């Protein structure tokens, strides 16, 4: 069984420029559990990102939350980069404060 991850990138609170927040990347629905997730600021990997402990849904597929403190601004761009055996190349999902 191989299942590709669903990915959502979003903030803990509604974004306000200049206000501290948390940037989240939630990966779910995947199998096997080996996965690589980076959070990016203007294309560069953010250091010391934390993540939840591996758990799974009723259908056995896995989910993980990756997160870091961040202070959004007008011009800084954030994204999540995910690699998994189901992917021919890493998937980059950009953060959109309206989603």
């Amino acid at each position: 069984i191989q299942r590709t991850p669903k990915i959502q990138v979003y903030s803990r609170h509604p974004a306000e420029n200049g206000k501290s927040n948390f940037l989240n990347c939630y990966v779910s629905g995947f199998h096997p559990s080996d996965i690589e997730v980076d959070l990016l600021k203007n294309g560069e990997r953010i250091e010391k990102v934390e993540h939840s402990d591996l758990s799974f849904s009723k259908d056995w597929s896995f989910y993980l939350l990756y997160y870091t403190e961040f202070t959004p601004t007008e011009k800084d761009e954030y994204a999540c980069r995910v690699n998994h055996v189901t992917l021919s190349q890493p998937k980059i999902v950009k953060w959109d404060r309206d989603m």
Partner: protein, 276 residues
């Protein structure tokens, strides 16, 4: 109301890279409360919710020993599964198990669970009777025969009907401030122009607990199920959850659309509209 307790376990083999990694977590309802990771230095089961921290050292010692025993059983079981499926020792494989109980508002057992999966597929499950087994294939039938001979179902039934329910009730009392509190969603509607002809209305539900929620859009009182983009409910990272539902609407018709929100924490279901 009704409540659940679950323990989830995953072992992942990694040939040539030491013994399998073993991670287990425990939940009450949608609240994580304990975790164990074999790759920690001198691993112990650790608290993840405030109301479990009061358990004494004997509790943590016993839980930690159970987790270490489970990791060891899984290592052996992973080797057995290579035999049962005629697989080589070269690949990484996954063994998962979940068990636990649901209780009703009076605290009595509603249902017990114990089920195992190999490489992401059902392997063997205890049936709802807590007395018979469903094996997914002829390999799991070998396990079924062994577990019938060893009366495993009877051992699980005794736990699920007894300690599982009794300890769940203890946790619900000790954690009543949070486990018995539903936080309603904070809701609002945003408007996102697509063109001069159409815009997206997005209905947000934020900060709610537990995760169960219903969000729907209506136009003139008729459901827009086929036209609604509904994202998967997602964790905020602070115990609470988020969800949104979106519809594309013709410009100027926004007031025909209503978002409807149902959640246990709401005094009554909400109807919301875009408010410029």
């Amino acid at each position: 109301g009704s409540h659940s307790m679950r323990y989830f376990h995953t072992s992942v083999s990694r040939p040539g890279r030491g013994e399998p990694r073993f991670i287990t977590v425990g939940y009450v309802d949608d609240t994580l409360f304990v975790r164990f990771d074999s790759d920690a230095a001198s691993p112990r089961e650790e608290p993840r919710a405030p109301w479990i921290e009061q358990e004494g050292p004997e509790y943590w010692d016993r839980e930690t020993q159970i987790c270490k025993a489970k990791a060891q059983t899984d290592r052996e079981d992973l080797r057995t599964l290579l035999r049962y499926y005629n697989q080589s020792e070269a690949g990484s494989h996954t063994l998962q198990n979940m068990y636990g109980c649901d209780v009703g508002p009076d605290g009595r057992l509603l249902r017990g669970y114990h089920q195992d999966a190999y490489d992401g597929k059902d392997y063997i499950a205890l049936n709802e009777d807590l007395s018979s087994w469903t094996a997914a294939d002829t390999a799991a039938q070998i396990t079924q025969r062994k577990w019938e001979a060893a009366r495993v179902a009877e051992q699980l039934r005794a736990y699920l009907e007894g300690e599982c329910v009794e300890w769940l009730r203890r946790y619900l009392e000790n954690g009543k401030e949070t486990l018995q509190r539903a936080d309603p969603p904070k809701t609002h509607v945003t408007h996102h122009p697509i063109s001069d002809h159409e815009a997206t209305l997005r209905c947000w539900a934020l900060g709610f607990y537990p995760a169960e929620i219903t969000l729907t859009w209506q136009r003139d009182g008729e459901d827009q199920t086929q036209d609604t983009e509904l994202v998967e409910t997602r964790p905020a990272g602070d115990r609470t959850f988020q969800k949104w539902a979106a519809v594309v609407v013709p410009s100027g018709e926004e007031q025909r659309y209503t978002c409807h929100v149902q959640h246990e924490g709401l005094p009554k279901p909400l109807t919301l509209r875009w408010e410029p």
